[PDB]
């Protein structure tokens, strides 16, 4: 018997909102001059500290604690960059043409173009926050989409006891889908508009996967370049995708 299946729609939103990680700050110094590796060093330092909060945020996600320890590791190893990217996109939603990596680090594409290869990832992140701004995404819907990424990005890459846990994950995903529809019904949307918005939101997750795959490849060349420092946890997450 699990708790994630016994949660109501409002209880699902309250649990995901209380589990929201904080907005960490960057070590950015405007006095200090700026290199291609200095900017990436700030972004990789920030992502590492955010990984510590994400690991503890995932524990408070309904159903995630009911999973095998090895199953929890697999889901995070495949979704960690997706979740970082959607969090960055969500924060940058109120800043057209800029990415809010940290409250003290707001970068436009020209500042972010100082790192080669990062220009493409930068534009895709800006286009995702533009799409969220056009749709007027709500925080109740964002925390739902982020929990969907955590549970869905690693189920198709995981015997009868192992399929019982996989069938349990899909029951939690269906609970979050019911919650998304319950949120849209309160906003006055008709039954036709709820299905369209639900489809529009889940299709964006396909783009976030594309950004994470491309972002994971650029992070790999940064390792071999060896110029930008990478933490041991960030290097473990990188070895999880290549292997």
């Amino acid at each position: 018997n699990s708790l994630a299946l016994s949660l109501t729609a409002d209880q699902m939103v309250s649990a995901l909102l209380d589990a929201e990680p904080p907005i960490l700050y960057s070590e950015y110094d405007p006095t200090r001059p700026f290199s291609e590796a200095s900017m990436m060093g700030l972004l990789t330092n920030l992502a590492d500290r955010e990984l510590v909060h994400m690991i503890n945020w995932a524990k408070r996600v309904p159903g995630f604690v009911d999973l095998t320890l090895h199953d929890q590791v697999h889901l995070l190893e495949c979704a960690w960059l997706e979740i970082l990217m959607i969090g960055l996109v969500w924060r940058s939603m109120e800043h057209p043409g800029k990415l809010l990596f940290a409250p003290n680090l707001l970068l436009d594409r020209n500042q972010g173009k100082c790192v080669e290869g990062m220009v493409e990832i930068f534009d895709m992140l800006l286009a995702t926050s533009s799409r969220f701004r056009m749709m007027n995404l709500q925080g109740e819907e964002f925390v739902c989409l982020k929990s969907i990424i955590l549970l869905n990005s690693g189920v198709y890459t995981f015997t009868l006891k192992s399929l019982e846990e996989k069938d349990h994950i899909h029951r939690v995903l269906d609970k979050i889908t019911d919650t998304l529809i319950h949120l849209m019904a309160k906003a006055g949307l008709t039954l036709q508009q709820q299905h369209q918005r639900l489809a529009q939101l889940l299709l964006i997750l396909s783009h976030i996967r594309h950004m994470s795959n491309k972002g994971m490849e650029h992070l790999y060349s940064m390792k071999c370049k060896n110029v930008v420092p990478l933490s041991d946890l960030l290097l473990e997450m990188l070895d999880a995708h290549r292997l």
Binding site: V52, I55, N56, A58, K59, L69, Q72, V73, L76, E77, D232, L233, E236, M237
Partner: peptide, 10 residues
């Protein structure tokens, strides 16, 4: 695995 034990801390 660092991710293993961080999920494991209680």
């Amino acid at each position: 695995k660092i991710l293993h034990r961080l999920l494991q801390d209680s």
